[PDB]
Design a protein around this ligand. Structure first.
Ligand SMILES: C[C@@H](Oc1cc(-c2cnn(C3CCNCC3)c2)cnc1N)c1c(Cl)ccc(F)c1Cl
Length: 293
């Protein structure tokens, strides 16, 4: 059985908290490879399933993601409640994030003449800060996520007390041990997609793109551009324009995250300070978000 090392220590399948299957009830589906359910163990949970029709590599991938998430301990990384690996289909049990993924949330919660005040600049800044805090924890523990993006973040709830958390660690799992068309090239810095070089500054670039996703309210990055067009665009120095109504101080964080040389990009401590300073600036947080008609 394969081992996993994080923050100094090594763990194995034996270290995962096995929850007796009889104690697990599935309630409803929550919408690729394997299904997700709302469940109860009472403790409410999200259940990620491994299809019984899978390869040996699939099994090991499933095991590795369980190990990875179980070994993190931070408020902005989704918790793993445990696993049920001794029955089929196999389960990973996660903290239930009723807000759903960040991309879907932003698109369905965009200000509307029906809901003119569904979201404000401060809400977006708080989400950005939440994820940045999660990224800082990963960075200080020498973990490179490789796929920081809105689709991979979850929210505790739709309402005002919401907390955003990094949730999907599939890319990191894959690399820890595929194809060009599945690579998240629109979130990747030049040295990543060209040389396959990944560092903490990789996640900084991706976080810049996430920031754009957030302040665009859930648009796909590089509108109208294909993966290869983005690759050539970014390699040549091209960068995205500010999202609609984006305050200048916020856009400047994005452009710093997208510096061509990794050494010129901020670490997450600095990104956090700059997000904090934005939340303090009345001219930033008093800026109205566009209302979608
Ligand atoms: C594996 C799966 O886990 C969860 C999904 C969800 C989820 C997905 N969708 N929804 C909706 C349920 C109905 N109300 C709106 C959100 C909740 C909540 N908690 C989870 N732990 C998941 C999904 Cl499905 C998408 C992105 C992620 F980063 C993750 Cl980690």
């Amino acid at each position: 059985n394969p081992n996993y090392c994080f923050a100094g220590k090594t763990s194995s399948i034996s270290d995962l908290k096995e929850v007796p299957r009889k104690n697990i009830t599935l309630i409803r589906g929550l919408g690729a490879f394997g299904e997700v359910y709302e469940g109860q163990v009472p403790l409410q949970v999200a259940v990620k399933t491994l299809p019984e029709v899978c390869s040996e590599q699939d099994e090991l991938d499933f095991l590795m993601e369980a190990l990875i998430i179980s070994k993190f301990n931070h408020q902005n990384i989704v918790r793993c409640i445990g696993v049920s690996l001794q029955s089929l289909p196999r389960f990973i049990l996660m903290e239930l994030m009723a807000g759903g993924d960040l991309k879907s949330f932003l698109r369905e919660t965009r200000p509307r003449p029906s809901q003119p005040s569904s979201l404000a600049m401060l809400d977006l800044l708080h989400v950005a800060r939440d994820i940045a805090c999660g990224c800082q924890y990963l960075e200080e523990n020498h973990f490179i996520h490789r796929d920081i993006a809105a689709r991979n973040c979850l929210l505790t709830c739709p309402g005002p007390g919401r907390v955003a958390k990094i949730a999907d660690f599939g890319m990191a799992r894959d690399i820890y041990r595929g194809g060009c068309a599945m690579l998240p090239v629109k979130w990747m810095p030049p040295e990543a997609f060209m040389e396959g070089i990944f560092t903490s500054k990789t996640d900084t670039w991706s976080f810049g793109v996430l920031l754009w996703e957030i302040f665009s309210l859930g648009y796909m990055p590089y509108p109208s551009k294909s993966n290869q067009e983005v690759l050539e665009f970014v390699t040549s120095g091209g960068r995205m324009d500010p999202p609609k109504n984006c305050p200048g101080p916020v856009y400047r964080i994005m452009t710093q995250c997208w510096q061509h040389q990794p050494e010129d990009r901020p670490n997450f401590a600095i990104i956090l300070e700059r997000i904090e300073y934005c939340t303090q600036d009345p001219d930033v947080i008093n800026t109205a978000l566009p209302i979608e008609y």
